[PDB]
């Protein structure tokens, strides 16, 4: 019926500890079970959640939230545990900070006194700027004004937690058991079974239950190997939605039956990219047979000309053409970590300012165009010219050619294997097989996670070259650039680098320069455009030095669905505005037509801009 959403999930959640872990595989579940202060409407605005009202002081340093009194904690079986109280938000911050939360960078230098508490300069948590004024009133005091602070509250590190429940659970809080957490969101977790099934049930006593349409959400684990019978399960009526893959063995019959139902998503908040390992130590998944090969590859990835040569030879259209259509491949393309229209800088977009900083860095960037839905980088002649310069400097260091680059892939996901094999075919043909060889290491899902995506330390990452992403956490360009800073960036590990042990290689690469540019940008809090311009300079550094090679965004791909379009929560940042938030999602009996979808998108476009204007003006009513 319209009350049951049935689909698939492909991630491997590892923990429901929403205060210590902020990997999306986990928070995509948590967002339906735990509410924060605010959430997102279907237009992208921030709207009340647990907080029914809020205020900010004139100096922008004090944010006060009023908790609605019918906000309650429930156990997994649905029984009420306790009303949510403002002290639960103080407990959340202290627990997340005392246990070195993965997401600690979002609050460490923003909440007043928190950095002094973290470093041990002052161990009195009463001096930290989070307080419970009474049971319904929580107050955050900041180190500096942050217009994006309210957007930060849609991340789970800023979610509340009951202190009595946390202390009695102790070590057993936030495991993979539904009984390891308390529930304050629209749904209860009926069942989780790893690599099998997820089931939600609507919470009848949730304060906003009258807005929750879908009563049951059933997700079955999907490897990504049989891209087919998801469409057959959609035909059966077993599934509410099914992706359609043009490179499947039956797309011909699938297209002619669903010709009027195939719809394409929008580009959303995930920024995808390729990156090098510049400090590889683990060598358990490699086609290299000798030290000379390993020494050669290690020196090559540290050469700027080599990285630019690979960057200019990587055809992003071909990589996207393997999963999506050969025509539809260009829809997903993205050339920056910060979306080019994420912010405006005077009369310029962010991407336009980045390109203006980029052209001043070298003639290899003249004419650069970082717009969406097109490949800014691919250029065979500049790739070959860069590699010729790289080849002459690497031979002086005793580097043998061809260079072997390892890239690890999930063997079971056919999209990833064929995509990485297209990068192999492109890079080997543009640069020459006598100059570079791409060795695609097909690993099991567990194995790939053990040595790449979920590798415990930076020295455990077993590759020379990888494909990863990042989701915006708050409304500021720093959210896409801070993760790669060499002081405390959470994603510094993907380069194989550790902030303490690898400081001379960090300086050798110029990552100290990049970190200082971000620190220089972060000090700008009165002139917001100047702040954006200085983050644009840092984005230009990352593009030019080619440790990161931006590729595409999520979304922009094809599917057939029974989900009524543009009803779910929507956001550019946070965990409360993506396709995993079922609260506002609505289902229909008939399959969505391309006519219905494109008309809804047009009106959603109009109504969102009108709604965003009104919410920006209404927000001034809260400055009291």
């Amino acid at each position: 019926d319209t009350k049951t959403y049935s689909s698939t999930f492909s991630g491997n959640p590892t923990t429901f500890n929403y205060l210590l872990d902020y990997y999306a595989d986990n928070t995509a579940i948590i967002t339906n079970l735990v509410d924060g202060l605010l959430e997102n409407d279907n237009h992208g605005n921030l709207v009340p959640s647990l907080a029914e009202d809020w205020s900010v002081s004139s100096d922008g340093l004090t944010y006060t939230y009023k908790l609605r009194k019918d906000a309650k904690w429930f156990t997994a079986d649905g029984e009420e545990y306790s009303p949510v109280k403002a002290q639960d938000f103080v407990t959340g911050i202290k627990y997340a900070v005392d246990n070195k939360s993965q997401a600690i960078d979002l609050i460490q230098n923003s909440i007043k006194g928190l950095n002094d508490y973290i470093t041990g300069a002052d161990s009195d948590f009463s001096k930290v700027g989070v307080k419970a004024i009474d049971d319904q009133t929580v107050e955050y005091t900041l180190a500096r004004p942050e217009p994006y602070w309210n957007s930060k509250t849609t991340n789970s590190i800023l979610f509340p937690v009951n202190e009595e429940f946390l202390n009695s659970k102790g070590k057993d809080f936030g495991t993979l058991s539904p009984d390891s957490i308390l529930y304050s969101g629209p749904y209860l977790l009926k069942d989780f079974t790893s690599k099998s099934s997820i089931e939600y049930v609507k919470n009848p006593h949730y304060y906003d239950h009258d807005k929750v349409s879908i009563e049951h959400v059933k997700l079955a684990y999907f490897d990504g190997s049989d891209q087919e019978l998801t469409i057959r399960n959609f035909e059966s009526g077993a599934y509410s939605i099914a992706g359609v893959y043009p490179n499947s063995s039956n797309f011909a019959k699938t297209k002619e039956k669903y010709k009027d139902n195939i719809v394409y998503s929008l580009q959303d908040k995930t920024s995808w990219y390729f990156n090098f390992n510049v400090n590889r130590k683990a060598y358990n998944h490699t086609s290299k047979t000798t030290d000379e090969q390993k020494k050669s590859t290690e020196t090559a990835v540290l050469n700027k000309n080599f990285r630019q040569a690979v960057n200019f030879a990587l055809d992003r259209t071909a990589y996207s053409a393997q999963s999506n259509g050969e025509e539809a491949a260009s829809k997903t393309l993205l050339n920056t970590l910060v979306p080019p229209t994420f912010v405006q800088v005077g009369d310029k977009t962010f991407g336009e300012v980045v390109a203006s900083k980029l052209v001043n860095y070298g003639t290899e960037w003249s004419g650069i165009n970082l717009a969406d839905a097109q490949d800014a980088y691919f250029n065979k002649e500049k790739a070959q010219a860069k590699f010729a310069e790289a080849k002459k400097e690497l031979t002086s260091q005793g580097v043998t050619f061809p260079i072997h680059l390892d890239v690890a892939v999930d063997q079971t996901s056919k999209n990833a294997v064929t995509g990485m094999n297209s990068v192999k075919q492109t890079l080997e043909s543009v640069l020459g097989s006598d100059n570079i060889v791409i060795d695609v290491q097909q690993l099991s899902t567990d194995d790939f996670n053990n040595v790449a995506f979920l590798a415990p330390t930076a020295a455990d990452r077993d590759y020379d070259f990888n494909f990863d992403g990042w989701v915006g956490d708050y409304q500021d360009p720093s959210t896409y650039l801070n993760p790669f800073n060499a002081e405390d960036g959470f994603y510094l590990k993907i380069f194989g680098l550790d902030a303490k042990e690898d400081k001379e290689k960090i300086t050798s690469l110029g990552l100290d320069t990049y970190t200082k540019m971000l620190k220089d940008a972060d000090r700008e809090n009165k002139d917001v455009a100047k702040r954006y311009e200085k983050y644009a300079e840092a984005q230009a550094w990352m593009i030019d030095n080619s440790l990161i090679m931006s590729a595409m965004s999520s979304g922009g791909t094809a599917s057939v669905t029974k989900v009524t379009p543009f009803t779910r929560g929507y956001s550019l940042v946070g965990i409360k505005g993506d396709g995993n938030n079922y609260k506002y999602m609505k289902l229909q009996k008939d399959t969505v037509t391309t006519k219905q979808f494109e008309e809804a998108k047009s009106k959603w476009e109009q109504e969102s801009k009108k709604a965003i204007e009104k919410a920006q003006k209404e927000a001034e009513k809260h400055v009291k």
């Binding site: 991630g11 990997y23 999306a24 995808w272 992403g469 989701v471 999520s554």
Partner: peptide, 6 residues
Amino acid sequence: FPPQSV
């Protein structure tokens, strides 16, 4: 934050 399905 780190992405899904990667």
